[PDB]
């Protein structure tokens, strides 16, 4: 069974621009897929629809057992605990330590504090930065910040991780390091969809490629080339 099932999705913004014009995409647990296409094709709109940051107008969309047409605002946090999200600009909170930035994504459950700490240390070890637990984001390189943000994204052990240009603000060396981390997370079973403009990454680390142009899927292929 699918972990993401999108059918005939249409999205028109308030000013009238139709950003998705009938997109259908099916993703199985454990897949790694790149989302590629020219500026304005609708990649960001597609990614945002997967964690309900944008609401679809027509079609259907299910993610991790959540019906994103039906889900109420009050339940989006629950969805966010099954879908981790990674951003091009990392979006750490600059006044919080590394520990606080990661712990913030874990829901408080009565006590929870000691359990939260063990899990924060687990994901820090997964990304190789346990020695930064008390650091602030400014003390970290861009690559280190994105590794911390990825630790935050997986802190609830989600089955899906969505990334919008996760290496777009990183230089080449750090871009490859972040790809290695994402691939390691994927090999453990997590489904990963990531939008990207990095032709060298897509052409080298071959995965499923979903190409969008003018709001429609034009190509969907195993181990595909970047094609742009
Ligand atoms: N015409 C547009 N084309 C592309 N992106 C847009 C457009 N209008 C708004 N945006 C996006 O939305 C952001 C601003 O959101 P906006 O609709 O102005 O809401 P608000 O001002 O209430 O926060 C922009 O930074 C951009 O990312
Ligand atoms: N908030 C917005 N309001 C109006 N138009 C928008 C908004 N955000 C994006 N668009 C437009 O919708 C289309 C798709 O944008 P986007 O999903 O960001 O594409 P991509 O990520 O492929 O560059 C573009 O024409 C863009 O200008």
Numbering used by the authors: 1 to 228
Reported in the publication:
FtsEX is a membrane complex widely conserved across diverse bacterial genera and involved in critical processes such as recruitment of division proteins and in spatial and temporal regulation of muralytic activity during cell division or sporulation. The component FtsX is an integral membrane protein, whereas FtsE is an ATPase and is required for the transmission of a conformational signal from the cytosol through the membrane to regulate the activity of cell wall hydrolases in the periplasm. Here, we provide the first three-dimensional (3D) structure of FtsE from the notorious pathogen S. pneumoniae, and we show that it presents all the conserved structural motifs of the NBD members of the ABC transporter family. The nucleotide-binding site is located in lobe I near the interface between the two lobes and presents the nucleotide sandwiched between the Walker A and B motifs.
Two different crystal forms in complex with ADP were obtained in the same crystallization conditions belonging to two different space groups, P 1 and P 21. P 1 crystals contain one molecule per asymmetric unit and diffract up to 1.36 Å resolution, while P 21 crystals contain three molecules per asymmetric unit and diffract up to 1.57 Å resolution. In both P 1 and P 21, the resulting structures correspond to monomeric FtsE and provided excellent electron density for all 230 amino acid residues of the protein. Structural comparison of the four independent FtsE structures reported here (one monomer from the P 1 crystal form and three others, M1, M2, and M3, from the P 21 crystal form associated with chain IDs A, B, and C, respectively) reveals significant differences among them. The fourth region (R4, residues 101 to 115) affects the C-terminal part of α3, which is even partially unfolded in monomer 1, resulting in a longer coil loop that protrudes from the monomer structure. Morphing between the two most structurally different FtsE monomers (monomer from P 1 and monomer 1 from P 21) illustrates the kind of movements observed between lobes I and II of FtsE. The distance and the angle between the two lobes fluctuate up to ∼4 Å and 9° (considering N157 as the hinge between the two lobes), respectively, revealing an unexpected intramolecular breathing motion within the FtsE monomer. In addition, two extra ADP molecules were also found in the P 21 crystal form. They increase crystal contacts but are not located in sites with physiological relevance in other ATPases.
